[PDB]
Amino acid sequence: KRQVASGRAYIHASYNNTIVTITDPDGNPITWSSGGVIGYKGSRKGTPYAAQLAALDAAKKAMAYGMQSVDVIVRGTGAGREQAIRALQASGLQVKSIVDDTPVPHNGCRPKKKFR
Amino acid sequence: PITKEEKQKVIQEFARFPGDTGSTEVQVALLTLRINRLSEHLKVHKKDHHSHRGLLMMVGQRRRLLRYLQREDPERYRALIEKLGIR
Amino acid sequence: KAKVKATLGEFDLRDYRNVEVLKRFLSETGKILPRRRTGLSAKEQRILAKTIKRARILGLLPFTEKLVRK
Amino acid sequence: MRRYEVNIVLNPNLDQSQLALEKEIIQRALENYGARVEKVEELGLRRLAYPIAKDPQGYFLWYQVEMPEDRVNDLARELRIRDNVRRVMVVKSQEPFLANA
RNA sequence: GUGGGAGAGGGUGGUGGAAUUCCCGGAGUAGCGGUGAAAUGCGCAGAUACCGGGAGGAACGCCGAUGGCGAAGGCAGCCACCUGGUCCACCCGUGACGCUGAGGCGCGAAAGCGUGGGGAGCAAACCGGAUUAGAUACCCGGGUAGUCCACGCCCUAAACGAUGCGCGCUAGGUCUCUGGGUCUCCUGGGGGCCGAAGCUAACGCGUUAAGCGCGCCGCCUGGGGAGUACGGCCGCAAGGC
Ligand SMILES: [Mg+2]
Ligand SMILES: [Mg+2]
Ligand SMILES: [Mg+2]
Ligand SMILES: [Mg+2]
Ligand SMILES: [Mg+2]
Ligand SMILES: [Mg+2]
Ligand SMILES: [Mg+2]
Ligand SMILES: [Mg+2]
Ligand SMILES: [Mg+2]
Ligand SMILES: [Mg+2]
Ligand SMILES: [Mg+2]
Ligand SMILES: [Mg+2]
Ligand SMILES: [Mg+2]
Ligand SMILES: [Mg+2]
Ligand SMILES: [Mg+2]
Ligand SMILES: [Mg+2]
Ligand SMILES: [Mg+2]
Ligand SMILES: [Mg+2]
Ligand SMILES: [Mg+2]
Ligand SMILES: [Mg+2]
Ligand SMILES: [Mg+2]
Ligand SMILES: [Mg+2]
Ligand SMILES: [Mg+2]
Ligand SMILES: [Mg+2]
Ligand SMILES: [Mg+2]
Ligand SMILES: [Mg+2]
Ligand SMILES: [Mg+2]
Ligand SMILES: [Mg+2]
Ligand SMILES: [Mg+2]
Ligand SMILES: [Mg+2]
Ligand SMILES: [Mg+2]
Ligand SMILES: [Mg+2]
Ligand SMILES: [Mg+2]
Ligand SMILES: [Mg+2]
Ligand SMILES: [Mg+2]
Ligand SMILES: [Mg+2]
Ligand SMILES: [Mg+2]
Ligand SMILES: [Mg+2]
Structure with a gap:
């Protein structure tokens, strides 16, 4: 109901999940x-298969609003961070460019015990 | 800080003779000025401890030269102290 | 690969305002290049780092950038 | 008196009525603090590397002065007062260290 | 003394961007998160993910190093003021003014205590979810003291080079920081690695000595009992010598 036909796609890939907007x-x-x-519930979400299907579900949803040209943004490291990109190029959506914008602090906040 | 303009003014006042830069009277005069520059810097900035250590070494060196002047010629020792208002 | 000082002129290492030359010492991101890539000496790199940080505060050099690849 | 360099960046949207006022204000502030101006370089519109005050550009000024050292921080406090003034960086002057000479 | 030099040395004020959290708005549906798998938790009062704007606190990515500074503890954004130490060149001045150092005095990471602030993230105790034979734990979700600031205490440590300080002497090679020089290099002062002689029980040290000497301080005399008991000094307490 929007007819955008061009826009951005953000890939938030963590070790426990990969999500696409x-x-x-x-x-x-x-x-x-x-x-x-999509159907996956547990640790199967952070898998490259789930990252692939998640990228393709949002791609077909964007076909409804008429998307053709897509600029890709990537944040985070995780399994299927590359599988989501690869699924996006062949999704029919012509990928315009691919940028990695993963936020890295300047050592400002103390991490949890897990990350030290 | 302490510029060479102020530096030469002191050395020429306490020199035993023209051209004297290293007499015991001269070093004590020079030491005493840096003492007063630091002692006023430490009235404020009371939490500056690493600069406080440098002052203890200057006092020790000043009291070392004065304890020496006492032994050799006690007159120039009195003329020096009275001129600098010490002890 | 060539190094930065190798392909350059006689420049002021202390001038924080010359962006055209200081842009050479930044990577694709806003990061400061290591000594292996700048060809500078020990005393030179320490001066460049402080002058790059100066230009960053004047809005002339970027703090960080975006990588267009992968 | 030591010799310094003043970098001033302000809003690059001013007309001439506001630009002359802001700069003649900077003149008045240096007069009150005893800044002998040795030379001036005005660059003006320059593309910034990141947004400053939501504005992608900045109007640049550069003054080289000789003034008493004790009054530098109070002078910096006086310049940041103006709303149009955004960046104020005062650096003590240094020798032009050359490289690849 | 003169003239030069490098530096997260210290104190004060100021200041910049990234990120976390929280708030406001825009947009936008059904889950996010988390693990070896999970569940508590959070989500239709609309979260996670995305854009914009705002507030607040704490820490400084790349540069960054096997690096530099300091007596040790320890010190990383940038700017300015105050400021300490140290090194080199000249061979100018004083003329043994030196070294160590029982007491004393000052400094002394973190944790802890007092008064008042501050409080984003992290997080003892504690509240939960799991694991398990059991979980008073490692793993997961929350969370107070605290971590931060001001002022005053506390005086401990693997406070480590497990090597007290100063000086003289005794092959070199190589990497390096920083000065000067007639600038393949020479010459100082630091920081590393191999190694002559020699020392050492051996590992290993070896011009930064654990070698050869000299001066002075500290300390040791089998383990458990025990850094405990008593006494004393100090401390608000914890507790310290
Ligand atoms: Mg998962
Ligand atoms: Mg302002
Ligand atoms: Mg400092
Ligand atoms: Mg400081
Ligand atoms: Mg909202
Ligand atoms: Mg519920
Ligand atoms: Mg609910
Ligand atoms: Mg509810
Ligand atoms: Mg708040
Ligand atoms: Mg590093
Ligand atoms: Mg050192
Ligand atoms: Mg100094
Ligand atoms: Mg002589
Ligand atoms: Mg003589
Ligand atoms: Mg001593
Ligand atoms: Mg003692
Ligand atoms: Mg302490
Ligand atoms: Mg503490
Ligand atoms: Mg407290
Ligand atoms: Mg937490
Ligand atoms: Mg926890
Ligand atoms: Mg068991
Ligand atoms: Mg249980
Ligand atoms: Mg809370
Ligand atoms: Mg001994
Ligand atoms: Mg040279
Ligand atoms: Mg050496
Ligand atoms: Mg042998
Ligand atoms: Mg060895
Ligand atoms: Mg020795
Ligand atoms: Mg031995
Ligand atoms: Mg004993
Ligand atoms: Mg016994
Ligand atoms: Mg004990
Ligand atoms: Mg007894
Ligand atoms: Mg007792
Ligand atoms: Mg008592
Ligand atoms: Mg105890």
């Missing part, structure tokens, strides 16, 4: 999917 050139989202949106 699709937005318009201004940043406001259109549709989205994840490993849990």
Whole structure:
């Protein structure tokens, strides 16, 4: 109901899940999917298969609003971070560019015990 | 800090003769000025401890030269102290 | 690969305002290059780091950038 | 008196009525603090590397002065007062260290 | 003395961007999160993910090093003021003014205590979920003191180079920081590695000595009992010598 036909796609890939959002050139989202949106429930969500299907569910949802051109943004390291990208190029959506914007602090906040 | 303009003014005042830069009277005069520059810096900045250590070494060196002047020629020792207002 | 000092002129290492040359010493991201890639000496790199940080506060050099690849 | 360098960046949206006022204000502030101006370089519109005050550009000024050292921080406090003034960086002057000479 | 030099040395004020949390708005559905798997937890009062704006505290990515500074503890954004130590060149001045150092005095990570602030993240105790034969734990979700600041106490440590300080002497090679020089190099002062002689029980040390000497302080005399008891000094207490 929007007819954007171009916009951005953010890939938030962690070790426990990979989730995909699709937005318009201004940043406001259109549709989205994840490993849990599709049937997977537990640790199967952070798998490259789940990352692939999650990328393709959001891609077909963006076809409804008429998306053709896509700029890709990637945040985080995790299994299926690359499988989500590869699934996005062959999703029919012509991928315009691919950027890695993973936030790295300047050593400002104390991590949890797990991360030290 | 302590510029060479102020530095030469002191050395020429306490020199035993023109051209004297190393007399015992000269070193004590020079030491005593840096003492007063630091002792006023430590009235404020009371929590500056690493600079406080440098002051203890200057006092020790000043009291070392004065204890020496006492032994050799006690007159120039009195003329020096009275001129600097010490002890 | 060539190094930065190797392909350059006679420049002021202390000038924080010359972005055209200081852009050479930044990576694809806003990061400061290591000595292996700048070809600078020990005393030179320490001066460059402080002058790059100066330009960053004047809005002339970036703190960080975005990698367009992968 | 030591010799310093003043970097001033302000909002690059001013007309001439506001630009002359802001700069003649900077003149008045240096007068009150005893800044003997040795030379001036005005760059003006320059593309910034990141947004400052939501604005992608900045109007740059550079002054080289000789003033008493004790009054430097109070002078910096006086310049940041103006709303249009955004960046104020005062650096003690140094020798032009050359490399690849 | 003169003239130069490097530096997270210290104190004070100021200041910059990234990120976390929280708030406001836009947009947007059904889960996020987390683990070896999970569950408590959070989510339709609309979270997670995305864009914008705002507040607050704490810590400084790359540079960054096997690096530098300091007596030790220890010191990393940037700017300015105050400021300490140290090193090199000149061979100018004083003319043994030196070394160590029982007491004393000052400093002394973290944790802990007092008064008042501050409180984002982290997180003893504690509240839960799991694991398990049991879980008073490792793993997961929350969370107070505290970590941060000001002022005053506390004086402990694997406070480590497990090597007290100063000086003289005794092959070199190589890497390096920083000065000077007639700048393949020479010459100082630091920081590493191999190694002559020699020392050492051996591992290993070896011009930064654990070698050869000299001066002075500290300390040791089998283990458990025990850094305990008593006494004393100190401390608000914990507790310390
Ligand atoms: Mg998972
Ligand atoms: Mg302002
Ligand atoms: Mg400092
Ligand atoms: Mg400081
Ligand atoms: Mg909201
Ligand atoms: Mg519920
Ligand atoms: Mg609910
Ligand atoms: Mg509820
Ligand atoms: Mg708050
Ligand atoms: Mg590092
Ligand atoms: Mg050292
Ligand atoms: Mg100094
Ligand atoms: Mg002589
Ligand atoms: Mg003589
Ligand atoms: Mg001594
Ligand atoms: Mg003692
Ligand atoms: Mg203490
Ligand atoms: Mg503490
Ligand atoms: Mg307290
Ligand atoms: Mg937590
Ligand atoms: Mg916990
Ligand atoms: Mg068991
Ligand atoms: Mg149980
Ligand atoms: Mg809370
Ligand atoms: Mg001995
Ligand atoms: Mg040279
Ligand atoms: Mg050496
Ligand atoms: Mg042998
Ligand atoms: Mg060896
Ligand atoms: Mg020796
Ligand atoms: Mg032995
Ligand atoms: Mg004993
Ligand atoms: Mg016994
Ligand atoms: Mg004990
Ligand atoms: Mg008794
Ligand atoms: Mg007792
Ligand atoms: Mg008592
Ligand atoms: Mg105890």
